[PDB]
Design a protein around this ligand. Structure first.
Ligand SMILES: [K+]
Ligand SMILES: [Mg+2]
Ligand SMILES: [Mg+2]
Ligand SMILES: [Mg+2]
Ligand SMILES: [Mg+2]
Ligand SMILES: [Mg+2]
Ligand SMILES: [Mg+2]
Ligand SMILES: [Mg+2]
Ligand SMILES: [Mg+2]
Ligand SMILES: [Mg+2]
Ligand SMILES: [Mg+2]
Ligand SMILES: [Mg+2]
Ligand SMILES: [Mg+2]
Ligand SMILES: [Mg+2]
Ligand SMILES: [Mg+2]
Ligand SMILES: [Mg+2]
Ligand SMILES: [Mg+2]
Ligand SMILES: [Mg+2]
Ligand SMILES: [Mg+2]
Ligand SMILES: [Mg+2]
Ligand SMILES: [Mg+2]
Ligand SMILES: [Mg+2]
Ligand SMILES: [Mg+2]
Ligand SMILES: [Mg+2]
Ligand SMILES: [Mg+2]
Ligand SMILES: [Mg+2]
Lengths: 303, 23, 53, 208
RNA sequence: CCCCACUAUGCUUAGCCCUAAACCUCAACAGUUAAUCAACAAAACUGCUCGCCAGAACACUACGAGCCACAGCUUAAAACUCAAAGGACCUGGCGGUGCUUCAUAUCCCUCUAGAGGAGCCUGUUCUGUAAUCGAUAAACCCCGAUCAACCUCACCACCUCUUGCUCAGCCUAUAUACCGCCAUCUUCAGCAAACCCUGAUGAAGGCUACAAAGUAAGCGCAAGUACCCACGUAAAGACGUUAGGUCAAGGUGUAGCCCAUGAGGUGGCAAGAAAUGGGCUACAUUUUCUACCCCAGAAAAACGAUAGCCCUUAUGAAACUUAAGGGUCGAAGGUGGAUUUAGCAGUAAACUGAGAGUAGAGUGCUUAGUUGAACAGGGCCCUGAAGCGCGUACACACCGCCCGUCACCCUCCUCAGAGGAGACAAGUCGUAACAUGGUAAGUGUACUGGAAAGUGCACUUGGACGAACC
């Protein structure tokens, strides 16, 4: 009830001041983020679900939205559509229909809110088909050359919706380079690509043809540079650890592509992304499950 | 309706015909 | 003697005909997708009344 | 699949990415603009923009693989190609200038043509009408045809008839036979076609 | 039942026969649509008349009677027996049930690798022993056990003790009394208290979005969370189903033992005629040995045991029997029948470690990691799933029900002894009926047959034909 919420608010203010005293911070400038940090320090809880940890927030955020009494002491409900049981939703529908009538007589940057968003706006429970009907009505409103007087309303239900180029450093001798990192399976690679070079590649201090004796891995190393047609132009130093030969080659490939992004043009960077050079392979070994031979292999069934 | 009564009558009649043929 | 060397035109016709059959299946499926569902919806909108209201 | 549905397979073609912007139709420009704002999978370790990349040979090596030994499978493939090329060069040099015009030495071309020859045009599929399945002749998709050609080639190589003969030599010899339209693989394809023709009477059992 | 041939017969004539689900199961005549009406069916009634009915079965029967009927038809009882029989519905299951749509390692084809063929490891069933117990279709079978030389141990033989380690004890029976922890569908998404309405206020049912009586708190899913993302894998997965597993984890009700079914000690079984399940090793040339961890050299009838025998070593008090190493031998086997397992991607497959538990002990189990695939497109016979329907004699719910023959004993009736009925009651041969009951069912009649019953002709729906066109 409202009196209970007011008492909770007063208790919250008293507690906020007490916590400011406890942390020695100024009560006046003592913010919600500071409250959160102080509570986290005072009551450290490692429960994974953040909602399970101690919270000292404002009553407005703590308690849900309680729909107000919709009829006075006289018994007469306030809203003319109260008896529909969905007065807010039907009022909204009625207003949208009126706007559509008015328009009919007179004449990637956003999205439609979700049903939960609409429900929270209306503090009412809706249905999938109710939401679909409302969205269809809104779509018709938009398409019907909705003017500013209509777009103002429409936007209330609208919700808004490239590789990061690394900086180029300069060595002690002044030659420019770019550094990047890349992980594949269990292999991690760090690559330094020089602006001007003869194509030499040194992996863990060993030349690439000696480190990766496999033509497949050398092809993987070639792929980044070959794509943007810069073979023989940049020298490379890679330090890679973990995983097998193929995983290490893939990690070096990713690191080299990310580093080379800085030295290629923006169109080249986008082309590499679309070619998949710049995306981290999320495929990693699946954990074995108890009671089955492998990650997916199950024990031979015995009928 | 099921035909249980008709089946009972049929069995009785078949048995009676067989008995008359036998004797 | 099944030597494809001396039956190239017939083999190519067979292959192209099979490809056209696949295309026909696909186009027919998409086009088929009045429908019984629509008809039932209309009948529901205007249902039979074998009784007294 | 660790990749969410949003992710799209990468396209690897330097020519496609270097195509002039003026040459692009409205739909092609739209496709490029859409991919500008799409998630793309990581480039698989099996393919690259290498001008020498051959998808057919890559797939053949994959089919020949045994237990994730990509290294051994690729080694066998390259040995087969080298053996084919060496045999062709020997024949070319030992042959007269007139027939040297026809003698072909490109191992990739020989491989492609041998597979295309081995591709079976019409297959036998079980079709069930009235509750009884019968091996009805049926047209095959190109994917199935290519796969059947490759599988027959590889199985013929793996057969135990050729004892103490290394896979490179076995496969090179069989590939040359197929290129010249001879050998057990072509025999098997003709046998499949003959069975289909014999069962031609059941074609109508198909419904699609 | 399906196919072929052929007869009586179906036809005409003259007589007989006089039966049908002869049913529109709805009598004739006259009348009404008003205050309805158990259910279903083909709405409810009024007046008048005739015929008929009075629990089921015995019984379209026996006797008597009549008849051109001679294995017949019409009329038609009684005795013994039972507490039901029956008609219509609702719910559930079931259907060799219909249509439509699906299964995403999934039911079939399709891809990969396997099992089913050899040896070995190991579990189980059987055989054996004086020598455990429990699981034992899916949902048991390297399962309780992340583990048996003694111990573990609950087993057998012998010996020993009796207020007993315990304010005793019992691995004694009961998982069909239970808690506890679980399998199972579940690779589901529904379960739902409290209300309201519909059915004449019956069991019951409650949907249509251009919406027509549903609202639902809560639980589950979902959401949230661990792992590396928001993906995926985990985890989670309600109500219930199989009286599903465990009285041997422990406790626990009931019952039972108390000079023993309790306790202790020594020794000992734990094997293979043989079948079968899972795994390991191989059958090699994409192989084997060596070096190296990927530019090599040799082998190649040899490949192939982790099997057997001998020796050593590790642990231990105890080692032929446990493990490791070495020597010795080089065995079966040459990619495997129908059938069958798993897998949708860092997955299958191959390879390499680590951990649990032990003093020691697994080819087992858990788990980290490396390399790393092919198909992913068609369908519905079978499996199944859903939706909408149909039938239903099943309700312990098709592993159901139930018919008839034959023999298994009593009551009654007819009878010169034998038949008939009923009851009791377990069998034998089939599966005739109930689902389209797997050939729809049945009436009359005729022939045939262990037996239900089959077939021929006509008749009935007390079956259906999926209900716009396709
Ligand atoms: K096998
Ligand atoms: Mg009888
Ligand atoms: Mg009639
Ligand atoms: Mg009669
Ligand atoms: Mg009589
Ligand atoms: Mg008489
Ligand atoms: Mg499967
Ligand atoms: Mg065997
Ligand atoms: Mg047992
Ligand atoms: Mg048992
Ligand atoms: Mg002992
Ligand atoms: Mg023992
Ligand atoms: Mg005891
Ligand atoms: Mg139980
Ligand atoms: Mg969840
Ligand atoms: Mg799970
Ligand atoms: Mg039980
Ligand atoms: Mg049991
Ligand atoms: Mg005892
Ligand atoms: Mg040995
Ligand atoms: Mg010793
Ligand atoms: Mg040897
Ligand atoms: Mg039947
Ligand atoms: Mg029948
Ligand atoms: Mg009949
Ligand atoms: Mg007959």
């Amino acid at each position: 009830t409202e009196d209970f919420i007011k008492k909770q608010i007063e208790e919250f203010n008293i507690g906020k001041r007490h916590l400011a005293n406890m942390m020695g911070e100024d009560p006046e400038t003592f913010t919600q983020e500071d409250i959160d940090r102080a509570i986290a320090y005072l009551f450290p809880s490692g429960l994974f679900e953040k909602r399970a940890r101690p919270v000292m927030k404002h009553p407005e955020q703590i308690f849900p939205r309680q729909r107000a009494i919709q009829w006075g002491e006289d018994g007469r409900p306030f809203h003319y559509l109260f008896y529909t049981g969905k007065q807010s939703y039907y009022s909204l529908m009625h207003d949208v229909y009126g706007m559509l009538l008015n328009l009919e007589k007179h004449q990637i940057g956003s999205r439609w809110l979700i049903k939960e968003e609409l429900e929270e706006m209306l503090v009412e429970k809706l249905s999938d088909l109710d939401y679909m009907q409302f969205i269809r009505l809104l779509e018709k409103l938009l398409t019907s050359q909705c003017g500013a007087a209509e777009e103002e309303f429409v936007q209330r239900f609208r919700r808004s919706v490239k590789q990061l180029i690394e900086p180029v450093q300069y060595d002690e001798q002044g030659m420019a380079f770019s550094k990047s990192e890349g992980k594949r399976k269990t292999a991690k690679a760090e690559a330094i690509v020089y602006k001007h070079g003869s194509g030499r590649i040194k992996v863990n201090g060993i030349d690439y043809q000696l480190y990766f004796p496999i033509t497949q891995d050398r092809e993987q190393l070639m792929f980044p540079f070959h794509f943007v047609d810069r073979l023989g132009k940049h020298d490379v130093t890679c330090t890679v650890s973990g995983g097998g030969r193929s995983a290490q080659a893939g990690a070096i490939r990713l690191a080299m592509a990310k580093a080379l992004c800085s030295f290629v043009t923006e169109d080249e960077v986008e082309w590499m992304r679309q070619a998949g050079l710049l995306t981290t392979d999320p495929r990693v070994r699946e954990r074995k499950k108890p009671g089955q031979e492998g990650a997916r292999r199950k024990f031979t069934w015995k009928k | 309706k099921n035909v249980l009564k008709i089946r009972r009558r049929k069995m009785n009649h078949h048995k009676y015909r067989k008995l008359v043929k036998k004797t | 003697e099944f030597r494809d060397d001396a039956c190239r035109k017939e083999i190519q016709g067979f292959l192209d005909c099979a490809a056209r059959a696949q295309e026909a299946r696909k186009m027919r499926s998409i086009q088929e997708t009045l429908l019984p569902n629509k008809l039932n919806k209309l009948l529901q909108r205007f249902p039979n009344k074998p009784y007294l209201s | 699949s660790r990749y969410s549905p949003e992710f799209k397979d990468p396209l690897i073609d330097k020519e496609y990415y270097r195509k002039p912007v003026e040459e692009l139709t409205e739909e092609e420009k739209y496709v490029r603009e859409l991919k500008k704002t799409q998630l793309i999978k990581a480039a698989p370790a099996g393919k690259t923009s290498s001008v020498f990349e051959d998808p057919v040979i890559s797939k053949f090596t994959n089919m020949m693989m045994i237990g994730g030994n990509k290294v051994l499978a690729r080694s066998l493939m390259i040995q087969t190609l080298e053996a084919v090329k060496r045999k062709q060069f020997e024949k070319y040099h030992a042959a007269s200038a007139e027939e040297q015009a026809t003698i072909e030495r490109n191992p990739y071309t020989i491989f492609h043509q041998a597979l295309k020859n081995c591709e079976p045009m019409i297959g036998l599929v079980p079709i069930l009408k009235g509750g009884r399945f019968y091996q009805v002749p049926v047209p095959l998709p190109d994917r199935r045809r290519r796969f059947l050609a490759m599988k027959w080639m590889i199985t013929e190589c793996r057969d135990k008839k050729h004892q103490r003969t290394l896979m490179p030599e076995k496969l090179s010899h069989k590939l040359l036979e197929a290129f010249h339209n001879q050998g057990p693989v072509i025999k098997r394809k003709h046998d499949l076609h003959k069975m289909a023709e014999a069962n031609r009477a059941l074609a109508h059992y198909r419904w699609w």
